[PDB]
Amino acid sequence: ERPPEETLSLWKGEQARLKARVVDRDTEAWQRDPSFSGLQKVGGVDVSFVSVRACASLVVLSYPELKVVYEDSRMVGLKAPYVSGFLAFREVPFLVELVQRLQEKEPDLMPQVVLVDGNGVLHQRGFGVACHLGVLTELPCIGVAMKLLQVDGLENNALHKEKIVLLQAGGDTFPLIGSSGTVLGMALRSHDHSTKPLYVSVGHRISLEVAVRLTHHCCRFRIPEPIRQADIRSREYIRRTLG
Amino acid sequence: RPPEETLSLWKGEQARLKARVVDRDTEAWQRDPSFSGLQKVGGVDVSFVKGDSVRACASLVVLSYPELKVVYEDSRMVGLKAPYVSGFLAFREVPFLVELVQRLQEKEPDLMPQVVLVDGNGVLHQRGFGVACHLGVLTELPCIGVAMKLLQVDGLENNALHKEKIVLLQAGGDTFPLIGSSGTVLGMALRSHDHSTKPLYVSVGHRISLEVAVRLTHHCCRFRIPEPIRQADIRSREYIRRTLGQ
Ligand SMILES: [Mn+2]
Ligand SMILES: [Mn+2]
Ligand SMILES: [Mn+2]
Ligand SMILES: [Mn+2]
Secondary structure, three states, X not given: OOOOHHHHHHHHHHHHHHHOOOOOOOOOHHHHOOOOOOOOEEEEEEEEEOOOEEEEXXXXXXXXXXXXXXXXXXXXXXXXXXXXXXXXXXXXXHHHHHHHHHHHHOHHHOOOEEEEEEOOOOOOOOOOHHHHHHHHXXXXXXXXXXXXXXXXXXXXXXXXXXXXXXXOOOOOEEEEEOOOOOEEEEEEOOOOOOOOOEEEEEEEOOOHHHHHHHXXXXXXXXXXXXXXXXXXXXXXXHHHHXX | OOOHHHHHHHHHHHHHHHOOOOOOOOOHHHHOOOOOXXXXXXXXXXXXXXXXXXXXXXXXXXXXXXXXXXXXXXXXXXXXXXXXXXXXXHHHHHHHHHHHHHHHHHHOHHHOOOEEXXXXXXXXXXXXXXXXXXXXXXHOOOEEEEEOOOOOOOOOOOOHHHHHHHHHOXXXXXXXXXXXXXXXEEEEEEOOOOXXXXXXXXXXXXXXXXXXHHHHHHHOOOOOOOHHXXXXXXXXXXXXXXXXXX
């Protein structure tokens, strides 16, 4: 099912209002440090389905060791359908509740930055789920997407695929430049033995260049370890109650 | 796991039925250089539901040859009266496959396959009478055993020397024989495709020679798994998904 236009119209209005609070530069001392000295805790989130039955997961990993120091998985009911450009309106209230639970249970494990599976400013109205989560919690957030959201002239055509071929080693990047001339994100080759890139964008309180480089440092495999461990735990949490 | 009194009975039945195995070619297409006259190849599968030991789906497919297109398919949810015991695979699944073959005979007798590829060994077996022999003897159809892992019987071992021989298999179609302590050839390891490295283990079920079984298995491989066994797998899983409503 798809929401009526009157509902999407309210949602667009809310995205435009909250967009004013996005901060697209570094605001934390570790972010300006050549090796991120002072960064100790990286968060990742996930919301998986068995709809209605879904699992929202939050993990916190140590940095740079990338070991899980916190995990929480909660069975939730998301009735909102998926509409591209409105991902936050189906999951962000449950992700906020997970952050609030962490604050009440293990406040010293509050992450210094959260990797979100979905875009930040690379978005139809420049305000993706990673921005939305960052503004509601005021945590620094990075958007990490597996496919390219085709907005502002960006398209996964042959020219885009040629640039992907030029990504040869882990850490290699190319910028996603919209028709406006704005840089919306970066395509990142996240490790040496993978060819399909990550699409990284700013959520909140971080610069793009820092966001890219940290994402790279969190990649044992293609998927950054915080997002990957949240994915694993949400489906393994499902296996425990179902089956 | 069944008590030894039940396994003893099963060994006795394997010994009785083994007498009817025919380990040579008895069909004209088999002795043809290009299997001309072969038109229908069967594949079977029995897949179990995740979390339910007892409920399983038995599937029979028939493919055209050489085009390898599905021309018949049938699935049935079944109740399993025995757990998996290595060496007794037939006593878990053969009753359901026989009933599937009989249903084909009653509904589309002109689509009866000329040979069946079975996911499991034939004579490469603890007592020389694996599920592929067992199916072949109960239906009198020619059958080929195709296994993914090496059943370690009569001196066969998936040791370092075995892994070395797998390395010497260079392209699709390359083989080496599986030799028992007695010196007899129990089956072949076959590299079934160019873009795979893990071999198939091929053995005679019934009414076919090993060399013919190996060459036919190879010709049914679009991917690593021979297309009749692969389409039966796909169908069982798709049928399970639908019975669950998903
Ligand atoms: Mn995820
Ligand atoms: Mn997933
Ligand atoms: Mn199978
Ligand atoms: Mn399987």
